């Protein structure tokens, strides 16, 4: 394992050092998005929750293609405001239900240390 706790105050500093292989060692799902919602990184734990193959969704748009159940003011809406503002740090519960058994999760969205990249962290609840 990579020991990093979900919701940690400095998590963006910690994950700045990880290559895709290290992200696969986290205890929770991790997705890196650009400012347009395109998927830059997607880890193994996220594929285990949603059944998506990580290598197959890199490059796709999260909100438009992969995860349209998040295309809502409660999720996408918060993301877009955060990108527009250049600051994002929010946690909420959500249900993932697109082409899968409905799965209640905790979502943590946070701006990355780098310019135009954003993290989505996910864990089961």
**Chain residues in the site for ligand HC4 (CB under 6 A):** 46, 50, 52, 66-70, 96-98, 100
What Rg, from alpha-carbon coordinates, does the chain have?
A: 13
Comparison of 10 and 65: residue with beta carbon closer to ligand HC4: 65
Q: Is 59 helix (H, G, I), strand (E, B) or coil?
A: coil
Own/partner contacts of 58-65, CB < 8 Å, gap of 24 or more, are: 61/36, 61/37, 62/31, 62/33, 62/37, 62/38, 62/120, 63/37, 64/37
Nearer to ligand HC4, 17 or 58 (CB): 58
Give the nearer residue to ligand HC4 in terms of CB position, either 10 or 48: 48
Q: How far is the CB of 1 from ligand HC4 (least distance, A)?
A: 21
**Distance from C-alpha of 85 to C-alpha of 73, rounded to nearest angstrom:** 16
- Minimum CB–partner distance for residue 41 and ligand HC4 (Å): 12
The minimum distance between CB 112 and ligand HC4, in angstroms, equals: 17
Q: Tokens for 85?
A: 């503002």
Report which residue's Cβ sits closest to ligand HC4. Answer: 69
Specify the residue, 41 or 46, whose C-beta has the smaller distance to ligand HC4. 46
């Amino acid at each position: 394992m990579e020991h990093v706790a979900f919701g940690s105050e400095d998590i963006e500093n910690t994950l700045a050092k990880m290559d895709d292989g290290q992200l696969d060692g986290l205890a929770f799902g991790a997705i890196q998005l650009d400012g347009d919602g395109n998927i830059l990184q997607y880890n193994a734990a996220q594929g285990d929750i949603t059944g998506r193959d990580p290598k197959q969704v890199i490059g796709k748009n999260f909100f438009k293609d992969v995860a349209p159940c998040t295309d809502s003011p409660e999720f996408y809406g918060k993301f877009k405001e955060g990108v527009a503002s250049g600051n994002l740090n929010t946690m909420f519960e959500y249900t993932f239900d697109y082409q899968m058994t409905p799965t209640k999760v905790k979502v943590h969205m946070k701006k990355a240390l780098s310019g135009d990249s954003y993290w989505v962290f996910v864990k089961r609840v």
